Amino acid sequence: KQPISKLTRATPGSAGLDLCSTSHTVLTPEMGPQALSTGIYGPLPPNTFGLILGRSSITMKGLQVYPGVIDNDYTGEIKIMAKAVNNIVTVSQGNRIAQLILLPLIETDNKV
Amino acid sequence: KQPISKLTRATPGSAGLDLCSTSHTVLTPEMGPQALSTGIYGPLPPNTFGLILGRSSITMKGLQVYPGVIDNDYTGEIKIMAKAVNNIVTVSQGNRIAQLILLPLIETDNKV
Amino acid sequence: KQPISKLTRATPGSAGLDLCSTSHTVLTPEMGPQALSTGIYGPLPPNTFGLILGRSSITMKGLQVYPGVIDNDYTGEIKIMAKAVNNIVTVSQGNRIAQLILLPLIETDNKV
Ligand SMILES: O=c1ccn([C@H]2C[C@H](O)[C@@H](COP(=O)(O)NP(=O)(O)OP(=O)(O)O)O2)c(=O)[nH]1
Ligand SMILES: O=c1ccn([C@H]2C[C@H](O)[C@@H](COP(=O)(O)NP(=O)(O)OP(=O)(O)O)O2)c(=O)[nH]1
Numbered sequence: 001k002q003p004i005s006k007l008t009r010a011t012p013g014s015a016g017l018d019l020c021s022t023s024h025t026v027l028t029p030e031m032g033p034q035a036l037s038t039g040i041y042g043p044l045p046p047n048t049f050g051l052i053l054g055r056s057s058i059t060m061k062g063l064q065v066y067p068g069v070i071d072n073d074y075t076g077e078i079k080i081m082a083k084a085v086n087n088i089v090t091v092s093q094g095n096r097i098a099q100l101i102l103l104p105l106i107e108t109d110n111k112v
Numbered sequence: 113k114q115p116i117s118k119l120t121r122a123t124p125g126s127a128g129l130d131l132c133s134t135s136h137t138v139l140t141p142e143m144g145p146q147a148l149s150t151g152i153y154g155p156l157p158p159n160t161f162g163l164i165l166g167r168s169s170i171t172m173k174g175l176q177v178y179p180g181v182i183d184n185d186y187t188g189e190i191k192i193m194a195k196a197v198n199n200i201v202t203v204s205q206g207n208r209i210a211q212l213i214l215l216p217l218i219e220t221d222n223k224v
Numbered sequence: 225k226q227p228i229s230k231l232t233r234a235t236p237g238s239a240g241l242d243l244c245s246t247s248h249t250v251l252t253p254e255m256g257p258q259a260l261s262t263g264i265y266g267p268l269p270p271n272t273f274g275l276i277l278g279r280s281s282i283t284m285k286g287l288q289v290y291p292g293v294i295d296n297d298y299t300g301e302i303k304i305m306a307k308a309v310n311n312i313v314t315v316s317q318g319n320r321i322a323q324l325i326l327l328p329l330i331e332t333d334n335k336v
């Protein structure tokens with residue numbers, strides 16, 4: 001297992017940490033949502049939660065990433081939920097497919 | 113009407129407040145986006161805004177929730193904007209279909 | 225080029241800055257994702273990043289906006305990544321098609 005801290009940013013001002021697919025995978029529209037492995041695991045830094053979002057270059061090439069919420073205390077593997085929009089999409093091993101954004105986790109009095 | 117404060121978190125580290133559908137609804141791909149009732153109303157806590165996002169277990173079962181922005185001062189009913197991706201999806205009353213994330217509302221000098 | 229500061233909010237409590245299309249464009253489902261011009265450019269205020277999200281009235285009319293991350297130091301044109309869901313969608317010049325949300329950019333020790 002590899003932690004969040006192993007992820008990298010494209011540039012200092014890049015909002016997201018890049019997430020790569022660990023397998024070669026082919027996706028077609030009729031397959032619907034698929035969960036792609038990353039080999040990267042939660043949990044997140046205290047007081048933060050994560051959002052998985054698409055990279056625009058990948059979205060424009062026809063692979064939609066469904067935004068996903070990563071809970072602060074999640075300790076499982078971060079998977080990318082993805083669907084081919086219109087056409088056959090081929091993802092190669094180590095391709096940068098999504099990005100992880102970290103956001104503040106607001107406290108509320110909501111019952112847990 | 114029920115306020116945000118009545119919503120619940122799965123767990124202390126869960127980023128989202130769960131949103132349930134108040135009706136039994138069937139969705140097919142050809143129907144396009146549908147607004148599902150929740151019986152839950154704005155407004156939000158001061159200096160925050162909301163984002164409606166899908167639950168991953170639901171996304172992977174073929175129901176896409178379109179991310180929605182809930183404005184701080186919205187006082188209407190929070191509805192879930194949803195679409196069946198590929199197949200017929202059946203939502204039962206009280207099923208947890210989406211989640212509400214609260215985020216800080218940044219001030220800017222943009223004209224209003 | 226026009227900066228972010230020229231954008232406007234619907235109302236004081238509106239989380240988003242409105243983004244309008246600079247061209248008349250027709251979209252059909254088979255076309256897949258399209259990048260719509262806005263004539264608005266980065267960069268963003270220090271310590272913030274942007275998220276492009278759909279307006280709910282537009283989503284419910286059948287035009288999906290793919291959430292997009294705007295990096296702090298992006299200096300290019302902000303484009304709206306959009307797809308007609310089920311039907312033919314016609315976007316007119318100056319129509320409000322998306323919104324820009326500003327969020328805090330969290331610092332991490334991730335290698336850049
Ligand atoms: O795209 C995603 C979304 C979620 N996740 C993981 C991280 C998060 O902590 C966990 C829970 O996600 P959701 O709350 O959105 N799913 P759900 O509500 O269906 O499951 P649970 O009831 O356990 O919260 O699933 C992913 O790995 N990828
Ligand atoms: O998924 C959603 C998205 C928005 N909303 C509500 C809450 C928000 O305050 C209100 C406005 O949403 P948008 O700003 O995204 N819609 P639009 O720009 O089309 O309407 P308005 O011009 O009034 O802001 O709609 C939902 O109930 N569900």
Ligand SMILES: O=c1ccn([C@H]2C[C@H](O)[C@@H](COP(=O)(O)NP(=O)(O)OP(=O)(O)O)O2)c(=O)[nH]1
Nearest residue numbers: 054055056057058292293294295298302303305
């Ligand atoms: O919907 C979008 C998404 C991104 N963008 C721009 C702003 C952002 O700074 C830039 C990078 O977006 P992504 O990081 O999501 N794309 P990608 O990872 O494919 O490119 P890069 O490797 O340069 O980061 O693209 C848009 O204009 N519209």
Ligand SMILES: [Mg+2]
Nearest residue numbers: 010016055099
């Ligand atoms: Mg990127």
Ligand SMILES: [Mg+2]
Nearest residue numbers: 122128167211
């Ligand atoms: Mg959940």
Ligand SMILES: [Mg+2]
Nearest residue numbers: 234240279323
């Ligand atoms: Mg709006």
